[PDB]
Design a protein around this ligand. Structure first.
Ligand SMILES: Nc1ccn([C@H]2C[C@H](O)[C@@H](COP(=O)(O)OP(=O)(O)OP(=O)(O)O)O2)c(=O)n1
Ligand SMILES: [Ca+2]
Ligand SMILES: [Ca+2]
Length: 421
DNA sequence: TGATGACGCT
DNA sequence: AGCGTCAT
């Protein structure tokens, strides 16, 4: 009676399907329902693919594939190019499409912007309200695109409905504090949210509904595209019993590899065999407690009330022979970046009633193994591109070993530390 | 041959 | 503060 079960909140994660592709398909109907991809920089191997329609994925086309290589798998692949301004990729169209979706989501609940195409939603309050509206049963008709993970327990839609039926058939609708009922009502609301997003933007999305952010995110990916998935507390032991550790958000990197290496396990469920102290011993007090709870389906990270980015940045690589070797080059490109940055900052100030107060300048030198050879901050007191680019140079001036030596393979300008205005 | 953006550590 | 990790 004193063991927490992490069933206190209803949390959703809404993620747009093949997002940059949908933005380009809305604009150009010729791309709709076709194997297509979004690329940046046409000149090297046809350009780098950064988003892929589900039709193209069926041919094996992936992110981070050169377009020329993708065409070997999928000869009729259609392409849309990222806009280029001031000599660099410009992502404005996708950021603006993002604002369309985020503003719609914000009508339903306060959201946390987690990326350009996804947000978490805390629906706990909304669910309580809808529950008061309700002791009536919940019809399957209200969950037309919802999967219940773990159920049923020979066509795709047939399986979905059978699982949904088993779920609804055993719900206790007379209990307003039932976690399973709360999740179900959550899923009804997310059906409504996803309907509004598609009606008002044209964009389809997937979603996960569970009791916390990590499970919601995991759920979202289980049935994509254009579907949503409910992961109940009860579904966790079976789900985690064969779930590779790397699939869980934040464990896809070196920490996750060390969990696998040090403990000699493969699946998230196997973590339950360790005491909290054992896990803290290996991975630190914070990670240890987090893992101990998370492998039990429990996580407390709040949905933060933030739908605007906290930083506004401009970045460009200069690979191989294109590395910047003269001061005229370095200053010209700092200026190009500063000009895009000023543009976005001025728009931000008018839209969002805030001003950035710190400019961060980051570079990479040719032979450096680190992604950043220098990261330095200075004051950002005026939205002026020439001043920002001049300040950036001043701050990286002493890096030159010299004519710029070694040549620079990356420049980065980032506006940070916003204050109300 | 990429362009971002959040958060943790000392 | 500057660096790193993780991700999208
Ligand atoms: N390494 C990456 C990953 C993504 N994106 C951009 C392109 C994507 O369209 C968008 C959202 O990324 P997702 O990882 O959510 O992938 P998609 O939305 O493209 O596909 P899915 O339907 O699998 O979510 O962000 C990017 O520029 N670089
Ligand atoms: Ca997506
Ligand atoms: Ca995403």
């Amino acid at each position: 009676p004193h063991m927490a079960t992490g069933q206190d909140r209803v949390v959703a994660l809404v993620d747009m399907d093949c997002f940059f592709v949908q933005v380009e398909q809305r604009q150009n109907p010729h791309l709709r329902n076709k194997p297509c991809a979004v690329v940046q920089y046409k000149s090297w191997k046809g350009g780098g693919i950064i988003a892929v329609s589900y039709e193209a994925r069926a041919f094996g086309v992936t992110m981070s594939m050169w377009a020329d290589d993708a065409k070997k798998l999928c000869p009729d692949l259609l392409l849309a190019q990222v806009r280029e301004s001031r000599g660099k990729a410009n992502l404005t169209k996708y950021r603006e499409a993002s604002v369309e979706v985020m503003e719609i989501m914000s009508r339903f609940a306060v959201i946390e912007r987690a990326s350009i195409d996804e947000a978490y939603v805390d629906l706990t309050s909304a669910v309580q309200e809808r529950l008061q509206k309700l002791g009536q049963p919940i019809s399957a008709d209200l969950l037309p695109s919802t999967y219940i993970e773990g159920l049923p327990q020979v066509q795709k839609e047939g399986m979905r409905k059978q699982g949904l039926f088993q779920w609804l058939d055993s719900l206790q609708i007379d209990n307003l504090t039932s976690p399973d009922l709360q999740l179900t009502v959550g899923a009804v609301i997310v059906e409504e949210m996803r309907a509004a997003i598609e009606r008002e933007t044209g964009f389809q999305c997937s979603a996960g509904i569970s009791h916390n952010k990590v499970l919601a995110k995991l759920a979202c990916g289980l049935n994509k595209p254009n579907r949503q998935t409910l992961v109940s507390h009860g579904s966790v032991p079976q789900l985690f019993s064969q779930m590779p550790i790397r699939k869980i958000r934040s464990l896809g990197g070196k920490l996750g590899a060390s969990v696998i290496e040090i403990l000699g396990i493969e699946y998230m469920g196997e973590l339950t065999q360790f005491t909290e102290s054992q896990l803290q011993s290996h991975f630190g007090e914070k990670n240890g407690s987090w893992l101990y709870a998370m492998c039990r389906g429990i996580e407390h990270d709040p949905v933060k009330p933030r739908q605007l980015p906290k930083t506004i940045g401009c970045s460009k690589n200069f690979p191989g022979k294109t590395a910047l070797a003269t001061r005229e080059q370095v200053q010209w490109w700092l200026l190009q970046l500063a000009q895009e940055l000023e543009e976005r900052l001025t728009k931000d100030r008018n839209d969002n009633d805030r001003v950035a107060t710190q400019l961060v300048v980051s570079i990479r030198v040719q032979g450096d193994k680190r992604l950043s050879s220098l990261r330095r901050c200075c004051a950002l007191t005026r939205y002026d591109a020439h001043k920002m680019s001049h300040d950036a140079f001043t701050v990286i001036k002493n890096c030159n070993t010299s004519e710029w030596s070694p040549p620079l393979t990356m420049l980065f300008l980032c506006a940070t530390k916003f204050s109300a205005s």
